[PDB]
Amino acid sequence: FACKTANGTAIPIGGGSANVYVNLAPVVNVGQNLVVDLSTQIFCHNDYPETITDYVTLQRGSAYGGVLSNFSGTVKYSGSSYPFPTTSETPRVVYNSRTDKPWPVALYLTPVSSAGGVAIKAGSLIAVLILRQTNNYNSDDFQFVWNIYANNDVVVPTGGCDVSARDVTVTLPDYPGSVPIPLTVYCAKSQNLGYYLSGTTADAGNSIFTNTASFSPAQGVGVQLTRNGTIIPANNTVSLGAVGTSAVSLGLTANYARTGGQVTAGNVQSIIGVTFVYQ
């Protein structure tokens, strides 16, 4: 029994327990999204296929761990589907080969949130699984708990929709300014969506954002957001209709805004957020 990996080092800390370091590749699917696929990185084999037979199975009470412990989902165990954490024993899988075959365990998650995702840092607790390994040599049984840790900064999305980027930095020209914002929104199912504007403002019509800089700020210069033909105010649900599965953009345009009379030369910097609302 040796689950040798190529991307990380499965150091057996605590006997059977180990801390494997694998990568994260979230796959946005229909209905049930993929979070962690252990069937492509960890290769579990047997050095003695003629004298002993490994029987890897899963016990009960194995939920997530860390900040994702309040979620749920399903799990795929060698083709068979089961909800995440199983109340009962899953059937055993035989292991009698020297060929480095993977461990077919795929972790899923039920989308209860619309568009946003949870940022996972490198080297953190993800999910706690209590495994179980028996043998045909004797009636002995040993317990061991493996932990899934990360090695990079990959944000796992929760919903069935995924945006292009999360950190978009645009550069405005020196007054006038009209540049588009590249942002594409794709989903796995044709459903209705809705976005709105939310930020720090100080005007009366709720269309001019504030300017919070750090070194020599500007006065009388505001940030105004709009589409091709209509200025979009703050806190207004704007629908687009039937969202396809192709590259669908918003069509936003960032422009300047004058509030006061006296304009002093300075630096312009603000914070603009967005939140998708299901319809």
């Binding site: 978009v168 007054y175 942002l183 940030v223 960032a254 304009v263 312009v268 910097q269 603000s270």
Partner: protein, 143 residues
């Protein structure tokens, strides 16, 4: 959810000048008044017109320049002797060669003005017969 970083920059653009040939005439003077050391002629007010300024200009600094002499005043370029030029303002400041002056720009009309004054005086007294020629160059600085 999704963060948007918006960064901009406001620059300063120069304005448009209107007047560039404000000729101040002194007329005719007598030699009896400039005989004694410490007398002067009458003042002559003059102003400038700086309108049509774009968004990004609030501080206009004007710089003076010209020829000087051993005293510290302006050098006459005529055939007359013992006579100099003095430039002052509405606050009692001596505007020499290289003097600066920064005023504020109104926003409701987007204009700017520079009121000045040119008189005629002597220092040592006893002005000779000749003409008075003086060229004053003013360069506009934007910041």
């Amino acid at each position: 959810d999704v963060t948007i970083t918006v960064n901009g920059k406001v620059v300063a653009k120069p304005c448009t000048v209107s007047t560039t040939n404000a000729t101040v005439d002194l007329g005719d003077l007598y030699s009896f008044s400039l005989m004694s050391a410490g007398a002067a002629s009458a003042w002559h007010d003059v102003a400038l017109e700086l309108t049509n300024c774009p968004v990004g200009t609030s501080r206009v600094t004007a710089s003076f320049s010209g020829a000087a002499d051993s005293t510290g005043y302006y050098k006459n370029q005529g055939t007359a002797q013992n006579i100099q030029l003095e430039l002052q303002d509405d606050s009692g400041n001596t505007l020499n060669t290289g003097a600066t002056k920064t005023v504020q720009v109104d926003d409701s009309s987007q204009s700017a003005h520079f009121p000045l004054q040119v008189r005629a005086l002597t220092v040592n007294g006893g002005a000779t017969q000749g003409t008075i020629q003086a060229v004053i160059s003013i360069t506009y600085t934007y910041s």
